């Protein structure tokens, strides 16, 4: 054959892969965590968006910390040989490096470690995308086993992340809109960059509380990918 | 005079000192933090307890993060020359190293730094006690400027701290009971040790949620004191 380049991930496997959406809206009273109004809008938006990208979407609602770990463990033990990639979307409360189950926190590392290059062989060398809509603090504005991971954080390290009770979270709203408009044209990093601009320029908080009023947000793309990622092929 | 020993803090100054009680019960809706039912019982219990110890108690309710810092700054700028010690009680939500104002978190270091040996000269060499009833995580069960500080934590590092909506927090209930019974007999560390035993043996959570049910708690005494502390003198 002619000259071959390996600058982009092979996305023409029989299946694009799984898109696991963990939508946590209602939390156990004992946790003292509020209901995440609008997250259902996000979950539905994501389901539709990734459905159009040909991902096998599995929407899960209100999972405990135990259920989250078990689900991720089970998913990581599946045969992903015929799958091009893996996507996991986490919609919940959170802190830096943490995502909340309905009854308590789960270390993000715990979840992501299941898919490490040496722990999930059928996904080795394939893009593993983790999209996280959760706060990361309280501020207001052979190959490496960690390789091939992409973390699309809704907000910068140490900052709160905003969610509108009616329209859904700023990040997810923007992500879905950009994926819908550019998934068949742009490389993923460029799509996430558009998401960054959309969130940073089109949103500002409105609150009766001066402390939380007129605040801005900037998402945070964390890439350990080794190749360009296009959702389309050939 | 005869042989003199300097094993205990001089507690016979004209005044025992200030006892600042920050009682945060209701938080701004935007923070998503629950109301701390029972904390008023704690605040009243502490006020009475320290009143009997002859401390100049100042009860503050529902202070924002800005108000907490300002209060502590102002208090640290007062003349404590005629005061034997300083006590600050913090009742609020919290995380490891953090205490919540009604509208957001405050680094505990921020608060305590105001009273460092080199920043509050009228308190240099005197015991500075910080009693903290707040969670420290989500787990369930010349002289140094940092010298002369005592941190009476309600719970161990990384753990939740329990509060009963009717009787008040486990730690504060126990602390006040032990101070009332032993303040005129035992050295402070021994009193806090009794508090540890009382909390560890007399309390167990009851919750309809299996995750938070039948849990135990152990307070955490952190001492940087250089002398024994007796609330009584001569």
């Amino acid at each position: 054959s002619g000259i071959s380049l390996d600058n982009s991930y092979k996305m023409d496997y029989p299946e694009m892969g799984l898109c696991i959406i963990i939508n946590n809206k209602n939390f156990h009273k004992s946790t003292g965590m509020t209901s995440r109004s609008g997250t259902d809008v996000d979950a539905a938006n994501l389901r539709e968006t990734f459905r159009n990208l040909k991902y096998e979407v599995r929407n899960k609602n209100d999972l405990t910390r135990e259920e989250i770990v078990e689900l991720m463990r089970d998913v990581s033990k599946e045969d992903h040989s015929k799958r091009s990639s893996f996507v996991c979307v986490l919609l919940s409360h959170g802190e830096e490096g943490i995502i909340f189950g309905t009854n308590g926190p789960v270390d993000l590392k715990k979840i992501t470690n299941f898919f490490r290059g040496d722990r999930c062989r059928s996904l080795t060398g394939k893009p593993k995308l983790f999209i996280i809509q959760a706060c990361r603090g309280t501020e207001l504005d052979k190959i490496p086993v960690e390789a091939d991971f992409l973390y699309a954080y809704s907000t910068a390290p140490g900052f709160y992340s905003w969610r509108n009770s009616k329209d859904g979270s700023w990040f997810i709203q923007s992500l879905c809109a950009m994926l819908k408009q550019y998934a068949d044209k742009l490389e993923f990093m460029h799509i996430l960059t558009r998401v960054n601009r959309k969130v940073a320029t089109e949103f500002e908080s409105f609150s009766f509380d001066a402390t939380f009023h007129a605040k801005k947000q900037i998402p945070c793309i964390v890439s350990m990918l080794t190749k360009e990622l296009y959702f389309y092929h050939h | 005079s005869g042989i003199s020993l300097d094993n205990s803090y001089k507690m016979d100054y004209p005044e025992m000192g200030l006892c600042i009680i920050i009682n945060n019960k209701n938080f701004h809706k935007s923070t998503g933090m629950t109301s701390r039912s029972g904390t008023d019982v704690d605040a009243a219990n502490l006020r009475e307890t320290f009143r009997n110890l002859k401390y100049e108690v100042r009860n503050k309710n529902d202070l924002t993060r800005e108000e907490i810092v300002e209060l502590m700054r102002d208090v640290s700028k007062e003349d404590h020359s005629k005061r034997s010690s300083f006590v600050c009680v913090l009742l609020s939500h919290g995380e490891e190293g953090i205490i919540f104002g009604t509208n957001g978190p405050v680094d505990l270091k921020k608060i305590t730094n105001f009273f460092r040996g080199d920043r509050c000269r009228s308190l240099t060499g005197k015991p500075k006690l910080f009693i903290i009833q707040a969670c420290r995580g989500t787990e369930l069960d010349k002289i140094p400027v940092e010298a002369d500080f005592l941190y009476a934590y309600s719970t161990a590092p990384g753990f939740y701290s329990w509060r009963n909506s009717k009787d008040g927090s486990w730690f504060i209930q126990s602390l006040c009971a032990m101070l009332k019974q032993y303040a005129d007999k035992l050295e402070f560390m021994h009193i806090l040790t009794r508090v540890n035993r009382k909390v560890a043996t007399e309390f167990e959570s009851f919750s309809f949620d299996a995750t938070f049910h039948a849990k135990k708690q152990i307070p955490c005494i952190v001492s940087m004191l250089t002398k024994e502390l007796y609330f009584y003198h001569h």
Partner: peptide, 4 residues
């Protein structure tokens, strides 16, 4: 608008 609410924070997560």
């Amino acid at each position: 608008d609410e924070v997560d």
